[PDB]
Structure 1
Amino acid sequence: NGPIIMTREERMKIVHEIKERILDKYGDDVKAIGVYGSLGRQTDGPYSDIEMMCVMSTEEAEFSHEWTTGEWKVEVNFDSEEILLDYASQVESDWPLTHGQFFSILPIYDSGGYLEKVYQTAKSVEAQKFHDAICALIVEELFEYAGKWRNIRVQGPTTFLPSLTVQVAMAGAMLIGLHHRICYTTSASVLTEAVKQSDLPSGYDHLCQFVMSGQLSDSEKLLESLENFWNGIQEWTERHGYIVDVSKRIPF
């Protein structure tokens, strides 16, 4: 029932069993095999799972195998070189959470240096893409949440406020991550690493204190804390040049 305790030696044994099955099944279509996640960083804990990535020569290839044996769980990603390089060069709103997987790949097999090329791609993204992703995050995520908690203040339900506050704090950590071009190590340390950064929006550290401590029961403290962070976003975007275009009423 659930994940069992495993050692780093047992997980690496499973990884090489999977590599041999990938090489047996696809032969010389395999360009590279690598380990990412906590195992690829060699910081896996007793209950950690396994994540692997595979680069195929078959163009347009994109599939994944993810399973459990009842005791442990594995995920193996299969991508063509172009699909993986393209995704490594796209900056979404959750880029600080997702793209850290490309900065600590443990090489297992590589016919033509593909694992190194992916690393150089994710690390050489031009500045304009982060600027555009920040403006998209403010409109698509922050402005949306602001309307939701302002509605809760006047019509409820306050039973959603703790969940929304976690989402607002997580989106703020993405904003800080995009600003500093930082990818957080893992999901469990996103908030802890975000508040340690410079150039934080005003009120973000206070909002994070509620979420990290789990004190989300005082709705009136949370709503005032959210409104201060939203005001801190307006000063922050002007301070850093991130101008969201508001001039047009219908922009198409």
Structure 2
Amino acid sequence: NGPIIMTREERMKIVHEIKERILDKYGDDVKAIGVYGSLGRQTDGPYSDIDMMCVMSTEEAEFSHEWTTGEWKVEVNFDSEEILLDYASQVESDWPLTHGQFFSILPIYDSGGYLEKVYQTAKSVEAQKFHDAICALIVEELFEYAGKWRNIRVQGPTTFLPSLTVQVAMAGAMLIGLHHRICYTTSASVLTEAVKQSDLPSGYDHLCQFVMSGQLSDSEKLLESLENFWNGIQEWTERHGYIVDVSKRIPF
């Protein structure tokens, strides 16, 4: 019934059982096996799960095995070296949430320093990619969110405002992480680490304190905190040179 409590040593025993199954099934096509997530960081809790990544020599390989035993859960990703390195150098809007997995890999099997290659690739991403992701985030996510809460103020529904506020605070956290080109430790610590960073957009800290405390019932204060954060954004982007093109009416 649900995830049960497990200690670190029992989880690692499962990891090596899976590693032996992987090597028995795929043999010399396995280049490397590593553990990421909290278990790879050696900070797994009693109810933490298991996340493993495998580097294959197998040409264009990209698949995953994700299952439960009813008591615990495992996910194993299988990728070719080319596919994995390409993904590790691609900066999407949620890069600060996702790509921390490449910075604390616990090696389990490695025939040729592949896990070190993935780490070097992830930490050497060209600065321009973060600049482009920040500008895309403002247009694709933040500008759209602003239209949604401004609609809520004039026509509702207020029952969406708590969920929307959570999404906006998360998007702002991604914006800060992209600026500092720093990945957050884990999903549970995204907002906690975001508000402790420097160069915050004005109004972001105040907005986060609603989400972190759970006080999301005052719709008129939420709308005002969102509006203050939005105004802070375009300040913030012109100070750091993240300028968005608003000049073309049809840009194709």
Give the TM-score, by structure 1 length: 1.00
Output one character per residue of 1:123-147: Cα deviation in whole Å (capped at 9) or x when no partner.
0001100000000000000000000
Q: Name the count of aligned residue pairs.
A: 252
Output one character per residue of 1:208-243: Cα deviation in whole Å (capped at 9) or x when no partner.
000000000000000000000000001000111000
Structure 1 unpaired stretches of 5+:
none
CA distance in 1: counterparts of 2:245 and 2:110, whole angstroms: 45
Q: Secondary structure at the match of 1:74?
A: strand
Deviation at 1:10, TM superposition (A): 0.2
Output one character per residue of 1:47-105: Cα deviation in whole Å (capped at 9) or x when no partner.
00000000000111000000000000000000000000000000000000000000000
Structure 2 unpaired stretches of 5+:
none
CA distance in 2: counterparts of 1:236 and 1:60, whole angstroms: 41
Deviation at 1:17, TM superposition (A): 0.2
Output one character per residue of 1:171-198: Cα deviation in whole Å (capped at 9) or x when no partner.
0000000000110000000000000000
Deviation at 1:159, TM superposition (A): 0.1
Question: Partner of 2:216 in structure 1?
Answer: 216
Q: Secondary structure at the match of 2:60?
A: coil
Aligned-residue Cα RMSD (Å) equals 0.3
Q: Secondary structure at the match of 1:33?
A: strand
CA distance in 2: counterparts of 1:126 and 1:70, whole angstroms: 43
Question: Partner of 2:20 in structure 1?
Answer: 20
Q: Secondary structure at the match of 1:79?
A: strand
Where has structure 1 moved over 4 Å in runs of 4 or more? Answer: none
CA distance in 2: counterparts of 1:114 and 1:140, whole angstroms: 35
Aligned-pair identity in percent equals 100
Q: Secondary structure at the match of 1:167?
A: helix
CA distance in 1: counterparts of 2:184 and 2:59, whole angstroms: 31
CA distance in 2: counterparts of 1:173 and 1:182, whole angstroms: 11
Give the TM-score, by structure 2 length: 1.00
